[PDB]
């Protein structure tokens, strides 16, 4: 999975805070996975990098939270 696996690890990790904000991050990260799978089929590497960056920003918001 690579991108998906780190996002799902963030989905799990965030799922244990059970708040409103976090249920907004979970929905978003789920959408990043779905968008990532399509952009990989499309071969759009600039946007794949863009989403990888978004994944590393969400990790630094949900690392400080927990």
Residues 37 and 1: their CA atoms lie apart, in Å, by: 10
| 18 binds a copy of itself, rule: CB under 8 A | no
The residue behind tokens 């994944």 is: 55
Residues 6 or more apart in contact with residue 26 via CB below 8 angstroms: 11, 14, 15
Interactions with a copy of itself, residue window 22-41 (CB under 8 A): 24-25, 27-28, 31-32, 35, 38-39
Cβ proximity to a copy of itself: between 5 and 56 the closer is: 56
Binding site for a copy of itself (CB under 8 A): 19-21, 24-25, 27-28, 31-32, 35, 38-39, 42, 44, 47, 50-51, 53-54, 57-58, 60-61, 64-65
């Amino acid at each position: 999975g690579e991108f998906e696996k780190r996002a799902k690890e963030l989905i799990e990790r965030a799922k244990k805070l059970n708040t409103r904000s976090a249920r907004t991050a979970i929905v978003f990260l789920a959408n990043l996975i779905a968008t990532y799978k399509e952009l990989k089929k499309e071969g759009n590497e600039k946007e794949l990098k863009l989403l990888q960056q978004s994944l590393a920003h969400m990790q630094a918001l949900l690392e400080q939270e927990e």
